[PDB]
Amino acid sequence: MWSHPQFEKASTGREILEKLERREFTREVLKEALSINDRGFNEALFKLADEIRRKYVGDEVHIRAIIEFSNVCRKNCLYCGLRRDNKNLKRYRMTPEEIVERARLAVQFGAKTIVLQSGEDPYYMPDVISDIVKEIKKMGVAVTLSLGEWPREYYEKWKEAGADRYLLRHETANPVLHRKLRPDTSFENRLNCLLTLKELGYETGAGSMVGLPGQTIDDLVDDLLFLKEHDFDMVGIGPFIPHPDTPLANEKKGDFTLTLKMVALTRILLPDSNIPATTAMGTIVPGGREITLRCGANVIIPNWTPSPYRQLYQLYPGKISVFEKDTASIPSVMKMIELLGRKPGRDWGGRKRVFE
Numbered sequence: 001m002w003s004h005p006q007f008e009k010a011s012t013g014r015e016i017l018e019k020l021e022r023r024e025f026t027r028e029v030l031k032e033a034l035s036i037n038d039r040g041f042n043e044a045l046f047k048l049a050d051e052i053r054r055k056y057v058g059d060e061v062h063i064r065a066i067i068e069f070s071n072v073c074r075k076n077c078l079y080c081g082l083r084r085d086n087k088n089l090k091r092y093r094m095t096p097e098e099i100v101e102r103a104r105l106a107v108q109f110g111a112k113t114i115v116l117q118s119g120e121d122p123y124y125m126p127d128v129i130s131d132i133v134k135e136i137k138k139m140g141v142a143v144t145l146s147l148g149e150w151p152r153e154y155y156e157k158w159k160e161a162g163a164d165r166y167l168l169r170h171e172t173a174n175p176v177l178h179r180k181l182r183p184d185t186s187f188e189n190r191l192n193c194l195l196t197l198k199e200l201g202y203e204t205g206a207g208s209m210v211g212l213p214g215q216t217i218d219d220l221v222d223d224l225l226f227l228k229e230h231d232f233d234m235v236g237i238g239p240f241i242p243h244p245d246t247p248l249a250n251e252k253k254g255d256f257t258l259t260l261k262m263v264a265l266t267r268i269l270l271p272d273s274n275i276p277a278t279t280a281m282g283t284i285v286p287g288g289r290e291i292t293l294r295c296g297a298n299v300i301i302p303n304w305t306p307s308p309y310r311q312l313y314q315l316y317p318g319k320i321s322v323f324e325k326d327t328a329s330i331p332s333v334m335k336m337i338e339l340l341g342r343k344p345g346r347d348w349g350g351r352k353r354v355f356e
């Protein structure tokens with residue numbers, strides 16, 4: 001028997017970067033990219049993702065204005081402040097007219113996509129949503145829905161009503177952890193919803209939380225490979241942020257740098273995908289969205305939920321500021337985009353196929 005020394009870390013890190021540049025996405029390559037702690041490696045990774053972003057999605061940062069129109073949810077996800085068992089939250093629902101007129105105001109402020117998001121609130125489903133979608137589509141914009149898991153027939157009605165896109169983060173690709181954290185459902189059902197949405201012709205978004213309790217680097221690699229397998233149009237990634245009124249209150253928060261590396265690797269894997277700089281990133285680090293836009297992201301989602309409801313859509317602590325008026329977000333993100341040397345999207349910003 002003889003010795004088994006490790007290789008030098010800078011040279012190993014350079015080899016990982018070269019494998020990524022050559023698009024050799026083996027599990028060991030992605031695991032080592034996520035495991036390396038050298039911040040020179042990390043900076044090179046971010047620069048590679050930024051390069052790919054520049055080449056395949058360009059300089060536009062697409063602005064999607066989100067209206068979180070109900071915080072009522074029938075599910076009980078262990079991470080989420082809107083879980084039905086959290087009785088320490090005031091619940092609300094917006095009327096259709098409130099929603100449509102708030103959307104119209106976003107459109108007038110220049111938003112080219114309206115995102116409608118809620119808890120899984122049976123009040124609206126399916127027909128109230130359909131009517132809202134039809135009204136917003138008359139305004140000449142894209143409509144994205146983010147309403148959770150519903151039957152195929154609901155997704156079909158919403159597509160016929162004119163919805164363009166659907167966001168359904170897969171959360172975690174580990175089926176064991178998924179059921180533990182989402183006790184109403186399963187990864188299988190989540191995936192089936194995503195497959196149905198794509199079959200119906202939606203642009204679909206998936207994505208995951210980083211730093212969930214029980215989640216390992218190997219699980220993160222599985223997330224990345226899951227995203228790659230499906231070639232998702234959109235990928236939403238953020239850190240897990242513990243909420244005090246949930247069973248995960250005392251768990252570790254997701255790490256910013258690790259989540260940023262997940263964004264960067266997603267851009268490398270999916271060069272022409274639409275990848276937001278999520279509000280969760282801006283929650284855990286001041287300026288976090290701006291940083292993320294330099295590390296492969298190309299979308300931003302200003303909060304357009306109106307007072308007095310916005311403060312009640314408390315997925316995680318720190319999500320909402322009440323210091324400024326509820327119309328400030330769109331001009332604020334436009335100023336951010338200008339300062340980055342970027343520009344807002346010119347059109348609806350649908351995912352294109354320009355890589356390969």
Ligand SMILES: Nc1ncnc2c1ncn2[C@@H]1O[C@H](CSCC[C@H](N)C(=O)O)[C@@H](O)[C@H]1O
Binds near residue numbers: 149240316
């Ligand atoms: N504690 C937390 N930390 C970070 N993100 C969280 C979070 N709780 C919820 N989220 C994120 O918020 C997203 C939107 S929840 C609203 C839409 C729908 N009910 C759905 O579940 O898809 C979730 O996909 C999840 O990734």
Ligand code: SF4
Binds near residue numbers: 073075077083084120
């Ligand atoms: S993550 Fe979505 S489905 Fe789960 S409790 Fe929160 S709002 Fe409901």
Ligand SMILES: [Cl-]
Binds near residue numbers: 001002
């Ligand atoms: Cl020997």
Ligand SMILES: [Cl-]
Binds near residue numbers: 064
């Ligand atoms: Cl969108």
Ligand SMILES: [Cl-]
Binds near residue numbers: 167235276278
């Ligand atoms: Cl998102």
Ligand SMILES: [Cl-]
Binds near residue numbers: 238278279280
């Ligand atoms: Cl988020």
Ligand SMILES: [Cl-]
Binds near residue numbers: 301302303329
């Ligand atoms: Cl915002």
